[model samples]
Target: GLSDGEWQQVLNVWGKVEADIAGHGQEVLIRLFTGHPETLEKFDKFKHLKTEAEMKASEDLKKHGTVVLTALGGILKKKGHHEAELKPLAQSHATKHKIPIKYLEFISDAIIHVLHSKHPGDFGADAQGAMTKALELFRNDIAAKYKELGFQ
Candidate 1:
């Protein structure tokens, strides 16, 4: 059982995510939150959270609090879009401004804190191949970019 405040925080986060996906077709939030190839399937149920009050309910809170948060923090940002997006952005900016990749690292590190605190343990894998498959798909996309960059 979570305190009312803790529960509210969970609801707020889920609420925002729900709204973002509903309006933006899931990619934008996933881009910022997960960006895994299977994030769409992994979070299919999240799309059903249509109201703030509903998300605050014990069931939804506990479910998302465990897996979504975990994925968002542990795997999503670290192994997903952050590198793909940041690397290119930094490279483009560096080429023009003569700056280093330090900014990209700093931004990524800052986001780690935000993701962890934002969702905590809200994301998880079901212990089968489902979770890994989804993460792997998204990771592969990122990895492919590396190969294209000659780092493979």
Candidate 2:
């Protein structure tokens, strides 16, 4: 079973992509779901984008996007592989920090946008720097947040 926060994060990502497609049309959504095949199949919104042209375009974008969401999904899946490992972490983190479980959401949305905006080779260094910056900021923010909330 998914925790409320994790479930909400899933909805957040789905809603954003769905709305982007609704607003921008198939082009943008295809790009977002390129590396995430399972995700692509999860929503009816992606059915049309399964056509060869769209899939190919998505693949082109994936190399540039750093495949962050796909990697993040993999991490989450692994973390969830064992209920004991996942529930305890979520429970402890929430209890110790007095943080809303939703605070656990970490989508790397900024990086996804960065990937969408530039080609891989064109912004390789910049992408790496951006990733490093995002991770550092996330790490510091979470650590400080935990400390401030009385978490170890």
Candidate 3:
């Protein structure tokens, strides 16, 4: 659980970036693909894009990123009450996409990296820590669902 100040920091940082959801989301995906190229294989639609430039210029990528970031934004909006909403999405990824839990960590790292790079000094340790906890909670819920579904 985040302290009140930590929650405010999360909201503040999110508000700063919310307007550029697509751009920031694209950056997060790009970071993941660049750092861990093999992860691209998971996204059949994205794997063919090949290059960062190609992926960045893709409308499909933009749309998908928008959807992802928007969902994330919704979770952020709910503040502490995120688990109820995150469960179904996580379950879908586990049961339908069969995405391993590690990729969720990668996505969280990508988000943190983008948030830090975008805000630099403004995104201090407190904010990062709060975001980390939030992502962990999100990831934990997903892991629980994966376990429930008998996914390894």
Candidate 4:
């Protein structure tokens, strides 16, 4: 539910960084894992990587990061037309992974932080607002699926 202007801003910013999606995604995951060590326990593949270096170098991290970034790229390309696209991922996270909504919330915040840090000059207030709105929409879509599956 973003204005056309907001969508344009989001696309503009995304265009600049999309080429480095993997790096940015990895940064977001690393920030999340480092900021909240307990989060690592959720992912058996990531749980044993105690050090930042280990996490960064791990193949699992690279694969998951790429997947996340690829999905995000799809979201950006399709604008707000992503509920159908995101549903399966939401269901998997809710039913199989059992990822908490709070962690998803934190990951959203981490993504915003990464965008801001990476492109401080380009990520203006309007862009931030647009990205925030977009991420919220994405989070809400996933949460709705999570709830449908009777998850908290």
Candidate 5:
């Protein structure tokens, strides 16, 4: 669903995302949990934390932020498809993280929120559309996995 022009637009703006990957990733999860409280409820580790400060201090949150961001980053920065192991994500979810597969979509929104919030200059016009398109691809990959895993 993305054209080459859109890919170039996303890649052009991607440097900003790569600069402070953890910070962006952490905030993106926070935004996701904040906007959609149910997603927070889904997190066994994070669900118990009541405050943003607590989330920031969480090692689990940090690692998870790293996981989420790295997955999307790999998907976006590369040419060939880079799928989430799903096995790892599934294991993470099944053990401690414990979020449903469907809730991952909200993280996409959170990522977009972070992009819009952090880099208004780059994400202001065409790049927003480009990023959204890119995210859809990210979403599609996960969606496929969900189906493959029979999570439907």
Candidate 6:
């Protein structure tokens, strides 16, 4: 669902994100749980982290963040057409994890926040808009799988 220009912008910005996956990933996770406390309990490794400082101190949390970013990086490499990635990702999130689909919007916006905050120059308005739409497309793909799997 991304235009050619949007695809270019997102890929260009994703290149910067892929450079230090863990650091940027941690920030994205931190922003997600910080703004949406309810999402914390879904992550077993990080549910015990009561505060932002505690979260920052936890190595497991950082690694989980990296895992999330790495997966998204894979999908970005495909320009949101990674069916293989979505199958596992969507199935796990929808069935095993029983994660609410509504919370996805929180994560997408959280990623957007970190992208702009950390890479202001690279993730300008055009890039940010492209990234948002790209994430939306990815989320829809996941949602379709959720439906196909009859999750919830």
Q: Candidate 3 — number of clashing residue pairs?
A: 0
User: Can you write out model 5's per-residue Cα lDDT over 71-147, one digit (the tens) per residue?
Assistant: 76666776325544544555455445545655766877788788889999888778888888787765566566556
Score candidate 2 by TM-score against the native. 0.27
Find the 10 residues in a row with the least total lDDT in model 2: 100-109
How far is 27's C-alpha from truth in model 5 (Å)? 0.7
Q: After superposition, which runs of candidate 1 have C-alpha atoms over 4 Å from their true positions?
A: 1-91, 123-152
Instruction: Please estimate how well model 1 matches the true structure, expressed as its whole-model Cα lDDT.
Output: 0.39
lDDT values for all models: 0.39, 0.43, 0.85, 0.85, 0.74, 0.88
Which has the greatest lDDT?
6
* Superposed Cα RMSD, model 5: 3.0
RMSD of 2: 14.6
Q: Which regions of candidate 3 are displaced past 4 Å?
A: none
Q: For residues 1-152, write the lDDT of model 4, one tens digit per residue.
A: 89999998888888767878778878889989998787788988787898999988987797788788778878877778986788888988888888998987788888889899998877998899899998888888888888888998
Residue 64 lDDT in candidate 6:
87
How would you encode candidate 2's per-residue C-alpha lDDT over 1-152 as one tens digit per residue?
Answer: 44544444443443344333322333334544554444454345345666547655554343433343433334344423433343444445556435432233222433345444543443345444444343344444455545555664
Count of backbone clashes, every candidate in sequence? 13, 0, 0, 0, 0, 0
Q: Lowest-lDDT window of 10 residues in candidate 6?
A: 79-88
How far in Å is the alpha carbon of 47 misplaced in model 2?
Answer: 20
The regions of model 5 sitting more than 4 angstroms off are 83-102
TM-score of 1: 0.27
